[PDB]
Amino acid sequence: SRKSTASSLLLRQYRELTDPKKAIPSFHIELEDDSNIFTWNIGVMVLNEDSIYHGGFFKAQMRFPEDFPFSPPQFRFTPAIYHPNVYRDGRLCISILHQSETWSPVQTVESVLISIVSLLEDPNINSPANVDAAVDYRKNPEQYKQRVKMEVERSKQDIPKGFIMP
Ligand SMILES: [Zn+2]
Ligand SMILES: [Zn+2]
Ligand SMILES: [Zn+2]
Ligand SMILES: [Zn+2]
């Protein structure tokens, strides 16, 4: 009921983010089991040539509550990546997904995803989920860069067969 309303709202956004003319090339969107509208498997791409993340295909899972959009989704990198705002188990800590800028019911999946790729490139080192990565980011940029490069290379193993990287 609230679940029914949430599922219709999520389907509308899913269709926008997967319709050939509305899709955003940075984000490859699928549903869990090709049918669960409340759990999306997302491939995050960093199209900015400047980024140490460029060329990766970072798999993640976005889980939506049954009262969406009145509560935020959760977002987990699968596998975890080395980033100041990513917990060791892959959970992303980002202000737009905190209740109650924090989450609001006018936020969309598109706005969250945009915020996430922005945070990849510009981490919040003042509120770090991974203090090791936060320290490396500012004090050991070459160490940080080499760790991210390794993870970029690892991530290419998750590019689905047939998928055409943007
Ligand atoms: Zn796909
Ligand atoms: Zn390129
Ligand atoms: Zn948090
Ligand atoms: Zn270190």
Numbering used by the authors: 3 to 102, 113 to 178
The authors write:
As an E2, Cdc34 is the central player in a cascade of enzymes that includes an E1 ubiquitin activating enzyme, Uba1, and a large family of Skp-Cullin-F-box (SCF) E3 ubiquitin ligases that function in tandem to assemble Lys48-linked Ub chains on proteins to target them for proteasomal degradation. Uba1 is a multidomain enzyme that serves as the gatekeeper of the Ub conjugation cascade by activating Ub in a two-step process involving adenylation and thioester bond formation followed by transfer of Ub to E2s in a process termed E1-E2 thioester transfer or transthiolation. Additionally, Cdc34 contains unique structural features that are crucial for efficient polyUb chain extension through poorly understood mechanisms, including an acidic loop insertion proximal to the active site and a long C-terminal extension. To better understand the molecular bases of Cdc34 activities, we here determine crystal structures of Cdc34 alone and in complex with Uba1, as well as a Cdc34~Ub mimetic that represents the product of E1-E2 thioester transfer.
To investigate potential Cdc34 conformational changes that accompany Uba1 binding, a 1.7 Å structure of ScCdc34Δdist alone, Cdc34apo, was determined. Comparison of Cdc34apo and Cdc34E1-bound reveals two conformational changes that accompany Uba1 binding, both within E1-interacting regions. When bound to Uba1, this extended region of hA melts but remains ordered and projects away from the helix. The second conformational change occurs on the opposite side of the E2, where hC of Cdc34apo (hCapo) is extended N-terminally by one residue and sits at a different angle compared to hCE1-bound. Modeling Cdc34apo onto the Uba1–Cdc34 complex reveals a mechanistic role for Cdc34 conformational changes that accompany Uba1 binding (middle). Second, the extension and altered angle of hCapo positions Val143 such that it clashes with the SCCH, whereas Cdc34E1-bound Val143 is shifted away from the SCCH and makes productive contacts with Uba1 Asn694 and Phe695 (and 5b, right). Our Cdc34apo and Uba1-Cdc34 structures reveal combinatorial Uba1 recognition of Cdc34 involving a distinct Cdc34/UFD interface and conformational changes in Cdc34 that accompany Uba1 binding.
